[PDB]
Structure of Tyrosine-protein phosphatase non-receptor type 1:
Amino acid sequence: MEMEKEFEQIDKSGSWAAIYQDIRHEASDFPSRVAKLPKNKNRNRYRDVSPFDHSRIKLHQEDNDYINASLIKMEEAQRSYILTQGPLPNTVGHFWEMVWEQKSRGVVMLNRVMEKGSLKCAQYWPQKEEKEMIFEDTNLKLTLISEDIKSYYTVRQLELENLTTQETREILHFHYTTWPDFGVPESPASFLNFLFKVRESGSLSPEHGPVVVHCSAGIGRSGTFCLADTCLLLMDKRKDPSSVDIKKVLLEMRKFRMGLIQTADQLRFSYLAVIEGAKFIM
Ligand SMILES: COCC(=O)N[C@H](C)c1ccccc1
């Protein structure tokens, strides 16, 4: 079926939970043996969210190459994304090592450091120009260059230096700051505006490594971001845009990382975002 009318048909029939459970039943299951080794327990935020072995990002290190991060490679859309968990106190150095080694231009953050009164990720970037951060375990230095605070999101320019070679790179940090503590946004308008700002920066483009996107577990809000982007890109590429099937795209993405889209409300919100976004494109 088309999307907008399949949408109204699920709303009127109140069957979002049954659609979402079908997706969960049909999703791929692949091994995640490296994630579960005992030496990696303090590298995982949640015991039930792990990268598959076949698609995990490897750190360029001989001691321990593990990070909770996955490469989602979308062949028809010609987009790639790295989805990862919010960094932990003992993985902030690994996070920036990955950014460096994978040649990423942008980092997309979809959570706040504290939500619901609890810490959802580490404070992994500097808050003042004159107070830079040094990650000694991976030999990197990180400096805040500028910061632009808007009503729904903040953009930061950062300098990342590889202290071993003295090479430097400019990283863009795109921080969506207004996702509600419970549920999903009432309108997709600010999320779409945020997506378009990431696109306009060049961070999603083939002349760079894959964008790094994260929330707390790296599967819910993060999944919503890449699912919406990819579906809109396919609607631009194809002769028949109504042939884009959002459930089939989601199941393709779940071949690369488990659990993408965590609730039926997130699924509905993803439909809403693609539907509204397809009107603005034209
Ligand atoms: C006032 O800055 C507007 C603005 O978008 N700033 C952001 C932080 C930016 C983007 C690209 C390069 C440098 C800085």
The longest helix spans residues 264-281.
